[PDB]
Amino acid sequence: MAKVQVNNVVVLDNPSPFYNPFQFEITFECIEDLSEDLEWKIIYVGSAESEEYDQVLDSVLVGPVPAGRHMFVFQADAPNPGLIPDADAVGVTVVLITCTYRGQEFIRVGYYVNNEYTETELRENPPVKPDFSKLQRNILASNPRVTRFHINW
Amino acid sequence: MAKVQVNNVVVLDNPSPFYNPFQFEITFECIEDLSEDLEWKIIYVGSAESEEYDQVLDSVLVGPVPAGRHMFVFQADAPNPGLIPDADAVGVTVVLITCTYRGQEFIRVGYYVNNEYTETELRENPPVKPDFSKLQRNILASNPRVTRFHIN
Amino acid sequence: KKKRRVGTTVHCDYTDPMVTLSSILESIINDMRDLPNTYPFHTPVNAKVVKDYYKIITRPMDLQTLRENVRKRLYPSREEFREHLELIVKNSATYNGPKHSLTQISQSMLDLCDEKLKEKEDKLARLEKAINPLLDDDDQVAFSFILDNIVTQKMMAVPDSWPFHHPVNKKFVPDYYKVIVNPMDLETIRKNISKHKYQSRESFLDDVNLILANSVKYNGPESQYTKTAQEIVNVCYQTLTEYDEHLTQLEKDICTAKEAALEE
């Protein structure tokens, strides 16, 4: 009896300087009007191996909202390098936009993320301590990865 | 309904380097003596994106022009490579020939033009900045878009 | 002024020379697999050894898929092939880095190949002509130039048309591709035009109409997108109508040209 649909995501300002805040142009649809109920979260799963090392970058409480179609941008600051581990800094990582409806997550939106040095000389011989300033976030828009799980509206 | 029909355009110059001027042998006929005179124009279309990048290249004021057949030869110095958007540079665009009378523009003859490098090099890996000295303009062996503006 | 329509009046419909080239390319691939340290690229990249490679590479390419793409006969000319060779250099330059050893050694695996082409000029040119004959026909480039403007400048320029710029995403819209069986849309059109698919309006229009048709099929007649789609399609019709007299001439010439390279 599924109430809300995400229709599209659009990755914005990509690629960019590692520090810029993420931007996603989310597009969703909903059949009945709505009570103060949705819940969008951007996660930085920047540690391929362990979930004790991922930050939620921002929380947004969508609702109340009329029936029909809604598009909106989701601004959110960039993952805090401090809580990001060394060897784990210059490669692919993961972004998530999730959305929740009354306690329930019902749609996970994955994005593999490639953090590289943009500069010509450094990418050859990456320094021991990661210099995020010099880094560069190529989000792989081309190939989003989407999980949509049944809940009970 | 017109006063001056254009009977032939001939390119007498191409294929050519990009810096070389154009040369056209218009061969028009005019069915009535004209008190004023016709202004011909050559308009190069920089970026087919917008008409804020295209440029006039010359202007010749053929007259006072009676009736009869009228063959002339129009020259125009090539466009300034400085004001041609980095993108719309290599490849294909338009060249306009335009006759205006009594200050009314009455004909737009617009040719397709193909700017391409020749030695299969800067061709194969097209350089960041377009390089014009080694760039060849070829005017196309097809039709031109004639737009006879219907007021005179 | 005449009645001047959207539709055209022009209707052409009509040792295989590809196999001489198909061959030559394989004889060109032989040389690549026979060169200092070129094995890394010899096969589809190990998904298991190079663990995250297929996430940093959208379009992968390797001398094997290259063999099999020739035998599947994808490459109509020297050029189409060469480009996929560029793709190797490109692909590696991303994962391994530009100035890096590997990126610099695939460079030759292309440098010998385009220094191979310069010695085989006289019959390559000869061959690919008796393949897609409207090759260096001026009316075809003209025509396509127009079509591509009509898109970028007119179609693509329609208030809320962005959801027709790009393909519908299968992973986002599960059952779009269940209803729509012949997806079309603006980016795809341009590909064709660069690939030079359209030689009259019929072909082109057919692709174009789908934009409105598929949307009726999936969003419905009175839906929002249909109306934007209604729009796109019209800007297009109007412009064809405008250009009818002009296009009609090109279409025809495209035709003679073809019929001509045919019995001669």
Side-chain angles (χ1 to χ4, degrees):
Chain A
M1 264 78 160
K3 293 178 206 290
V4 162
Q5 185 158 233
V6 175
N7 277 351
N8 196 24
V9 164
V10 179
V11 163
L12 289 215
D13 185 54
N14 219 222
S16 63
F18 154 93
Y19 274 107
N20 283 166
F22 290 78
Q23 282 181 55
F24 305 99
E25 210 208 62
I26 313 183
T27 334
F28 67 97
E29 166 151 326
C30 34
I31 52 151
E32 44 217 37
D33 289 88
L34 207 63
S35 22
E36 184 218 30
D37 285 321
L38 293 146
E39 198 59 347
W40 303 79
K41 271 185 254 78
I42 291 168
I43 278 112
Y44 194 76
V45 217
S47 275
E49 269 164 312
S50 182
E51 126 207 68
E52 193 138 307
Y53 301 150
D54 29 312
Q55 13 197 141
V56 329
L57 320 184
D58 219 87
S59 174
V60 219
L61 281 101
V62 181
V65 148
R69 213 167 58 207
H70 305 287
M71 174 283 281
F72 91 100
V73 224
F74 189 161
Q75 249 278 201
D77 304 52
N80 161 21
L83 317 145
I84 286 167
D86 31 51
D88 222 289
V90 195
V92 174
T93 63
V94 181
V95 217
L96 303 198
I97 280 109
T98 54
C99 197
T100 274
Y101 172 91
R102 299 209 288 156
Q104 256 90 143
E105 212 170 48
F106 66 100
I107 187 262
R108 200 98 165 292
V109 168
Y111 271 111
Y112 296 104
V113 193
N114 189 36
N115 294 274
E116 232 41 85
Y117 295 121
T118 190
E119 297 205 0
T120 102
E121 286 257 56
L122 265 93
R123 213 273 174 191
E124 289 166 330
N125 15 71
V128 198
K129 204 114 83 167
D131 188 2
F132 298 87
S133 309
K134 302 288 182 234
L135 267 178
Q136 128 93 104
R137 167 181 31 71
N138 192 173
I139 305 177
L140 339 161
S142 289
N143 183 304
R145 283 251 270 150
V146 190
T147 287
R148 171 195 308 296
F149 30 43
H150 292 16
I151 210 36
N152 311 60
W153 317 88
Chain B
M1 296 186 180
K3 331 283 184 177
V4 181
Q5 283 280 21
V6 168
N7 291 154
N8 198 78
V9 186
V10 157
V11 184
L12 52 143
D13 65 277
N14 115 142
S16 48
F18 168 67
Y19 291 83
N20 288 212
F22 299 80
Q23 313 218 60
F24 296 95
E25 193 210 60
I26 291 91
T27 315
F28 72 78
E29 201 181 351
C30 160
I31 317 91
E32 201 157 31
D33 268 25
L34 302 152
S35 29
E36 264 45 63
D37 36 329
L38 306 140
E39 182 186 287
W40 294 83
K41 298 159 105 174
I42 283 170
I43 306 190
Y44 185 89
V45 189
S47 195
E49 178 99 310
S50 157
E51 48 205 0
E52 206 155 345
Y53 279 117
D54 43 3
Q55 60 214 77
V56 271
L57 314 180
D58 213 72
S59 165
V60 152
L61 307 84
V62 198
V65 43
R69 222 196 290 179
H70 282 80
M71 186 284 277
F72 80 101
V73 176
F74 198 164
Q75 284 202 5
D77 289 23
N80 257 65
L83 41 150
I84 301 162
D86 316 66
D88 234 288
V90 270
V92 16
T93 35
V94 179
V95 149
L96 292 148
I97 307 176
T98 327
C99 210
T100 318
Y101 182 66
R102 266 211 206 156
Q104 294 173 106
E105 166 174 298
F106 71 86
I107 190 154
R108 261 184 57 244
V109 165
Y111 277 117
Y112 303 102
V113 314
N114 191 25
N115 301 299
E116 46 176 3
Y117 306 109
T118 33
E119 231 298 305
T120 37
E121 275 285 47
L122 294 173
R123 182 212 218 90
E124 297 294 54
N125 294 25
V128 189
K129 266 275 187 270
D131 181 339
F132 301 84
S133 97
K134 291 172 177 173
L135 192 71
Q136 190 198 51
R137 127 164 107 241
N138 180 35
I139 276 154
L140 281 205
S142 45
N143 234 33
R145 204 196 296 112
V146 192
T147 12
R148 284 208 289 153
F149 279 91
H150 36 292
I151 201 149
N152 231 215
Chain C
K1 50 266 172 203
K2 305 91 211 82
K3 334 157 87 202
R4 64 177 180 264
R5 344 202 181 265
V6 165
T8 186
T9 38
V10 169
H11 294 87
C12 281
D13 258 274
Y14 289 140
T15 343
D16 167 76
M18 248 254 79
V19 189
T20 314
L21 162 76
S22 271
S23 149
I24 215 151
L25 295 169
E26 292 176 70
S27 77
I28 281 171
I29 319 165
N30 296 137
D31 312 343
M32 282 175 280
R33 178 181 316 179
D34 287 273
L35 209 158
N37 316 138
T38 55
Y39 56 86
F41 323 88
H42 281 190
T43 35
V45 171
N46 250 320
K48 329 164 191 173
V49 177
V50 208
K51 264 178 181 177
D52 259 338
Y53 175 107
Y54 280 142
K55 297 221 202 92
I56 313 190
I57 308 271
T58 324
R59 351 204 298 98
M61 188 55 22
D62 43 87
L63 297 131
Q64 162 163 42
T65 324
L66 195 11
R67 200 178 187 191
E68 75 163 328
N69 251 352
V70 185
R71 320 206 79 255
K72 232 175 167 184
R73 283 160 61 154
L74 255 90
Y75 305 124
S77 133
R78 70 171 84 142
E79 300 296 279
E80 278 91 15
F81 169 91
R82 191 231 194 293
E83 176 207 77
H84 275 39
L85 250 54
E86 267 267 271
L87 187 60
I88 277 85
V89 203
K90 202 175 76 194
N91 266 332
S92 83
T94 307
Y95 202 75
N96 315 352
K99 289 172 274 162
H100 172 63
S101 326
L102 278 176
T103 304
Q104 205 164 137
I105 64 180
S106 54
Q107 195 90 286
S108 285
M109 202 183 43
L110 172 140
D111 253 21
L112 191 64
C113 302
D114 311 305
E115 209 187 296
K116 239 291 160 188
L117 304 180
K118 208 177 86 179
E119 204 188 8
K120 292 270 187 181
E121 268 160 350
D122 232 344
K123 191 169 170 175
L124 284 167
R126 157 177 146 158
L127 266 186
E128 49 207 45
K129 171 66 165 52
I131 280 150
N132 257 156
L134 285 167
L135 189 79
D136 306 338
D137 178 77
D138 287 355
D139 322 283
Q140 178 60 279
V141 200
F143 189 44
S144 308
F145 167 70
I146 298 172
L147 289 184
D148 198 72
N149 291 119
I150 295 168
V151 173
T152 54
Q153 298 315 293
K154 304 276 185 147
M155 280 162 68
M156 263 173 162
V158 162
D160 12 65
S161 63
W162 184 116
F164 305 104
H165 281 35
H166 301 348
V168 174
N169 183 306
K170 205 169 203 192
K171 291 100 189 289
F172 265 108
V173 205
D175 45 55
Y176 178 83
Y177 286 91
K178 285 209 200 53
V179 177
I180 297 332
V181 140
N182 276 205
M184 183 54 56
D185 85 286
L186 295 187
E187 216 181 3
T188 289
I189 311 206
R190 286 177 97 261
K191 250 269 209 220
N192 296 359
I193 303 174
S194 41
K195 229 202 282 287
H196 282 104
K197 174 179 160 197
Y198 318 121
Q199 311 163 3
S200 70
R201 277 168 294 176
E202 273 291 357
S203 327
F204 174 77
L205 279 159
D206 296 345
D207 285 345
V208 187
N209 297 337
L210 283 161
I211 281 167
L212 171 48
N214 289 313
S215 166
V216 172
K217 299 212 218 211
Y218 187 78
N219 298 305
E222 307 232 309
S223 149
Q224 258 281 228
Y225 302 116
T226 282
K227 297 185 198 311
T228 293
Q230 271 278 46
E231 185 41 82
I232 293 166
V233 121
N234 287 334
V235 207
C236 186
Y237 298 151
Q238 283 165 102
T239 296
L240 293 209
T241 282
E242 227 182 331
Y243 285 161
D244 178 69
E245 188 175 75
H246 177 49
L247 298 169
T248 294
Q249 193 38 73
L250 285 181
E251 275 157 327
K252 234 181 131 227
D253 274 15
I254 287 164
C255 266
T256 320
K258 176 203 286 185
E259 189 189 18
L262 208 122
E263 203 142 52
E264 172 272 318

